[PDB]
Structure 1
């Protein structure tokens, strides 16, 4: 089937297309700006986005909201991961984490899917830790400073395939695909 991915993030598109493409699903990116509310939960941002987008973009469509939540920073940047990335950057995160030994954090991805007048959500979480310095040139955003649990390499040191197998987005996609198999045969 064909799904329109409403996003401005090219990295997210590659990861989604790579994952679902292997199952014959066609992903077409569509950069259509939509309202993102300030909220504590990525789920709420997605709900609002879908409600606003319905009737304005082709169907079926999907959107995604994700963030990096750092323990020693009380969850920051979280829902505002994008804004923080564009302002203080990875250097800012590292500066804030200077000297800290508890570098635990988690990435969370929430995918929203809309089809036949109904909305559905899928999520995935991957805990890890913030590295001491930037490492790797693959991926995007915070990938250079995030090491998923059970791995020595940062997301930036992995191929798209390796990242999808361990990331928050990969887990959300797995849940999404399992739902498609039993519902949208």
Structure 2
């Protein structure tokens, strides 16, 4: 049993299905809050994973994701939520106005911690920013301006199944499952 410190039940559901293949592992939500510090996603996850473990003292995970725009030097990054609520997708589009490089990526870092210490697992998906909002009612925030890899549709124009194998989130939990399967 591995706990997931978060207030979002959907995060545990997604994790359980990507990992349902492992009959010896079950992820369970634990309502333990923790400080999300200022720094890279990796630092936020390691700090968060240790804080919770120091409290729970049982195998646990934490996760932090972000949206990175190249021409914006990696901004918004770990402050993705904040920036979405203050200036949103319109702010990103205004910021990228006339920019030749519209490349961007999403990244997820899972922070795991047990008796033996913290381990980080990552997943990324590179792409580019559309010049305008395109959505079919399928995304959250930046999803309506992000076009993944070789696609011509943005995440918000794609169904859950169409994004199921390529997302940063999927890729991070697969890195995590590899660790679980290669366990000793």
In the alignment, structure 1 segments of 5+ residues that lack a partner are none
Deviation at 1:133, TM superposition (A): 2.3
Match of 2:47 in 1: 48
In the alignment, structure 2 segments of 5+ residues that lack a partner are none
Q: How high is the TM-score relative to the length of structure 2? A: 0.86
Match of 2:162 in 1: 162
Measure, in 1, the Cα distance between the counterparts of 2:15 and 2:32: 18
1:73-152 superposed matches below 5 A: 73-134=72-133, 135-152=135-152
Q: How high is the TM-score relative to the length of structure 1? A: 0.86
Deviation at 1:22, TM superposition (A): 5.0
Match of 1:172 in 2: 172
Match of 1:7 in 2: 6
1:19-58 superposed matches below 5 A: 19-24=18-23, 25-39=25-39, 41-57=40-56
Cα RMSD after superposing both structures: 2.1
How many residues are matched? 182
Deviation readout 1:106-165 (Å, 9 max, x if unpaired): 111111112334221111121100112222322423222111111122222233333231
Deviation at 1:101, TM superposition (A): 3.1
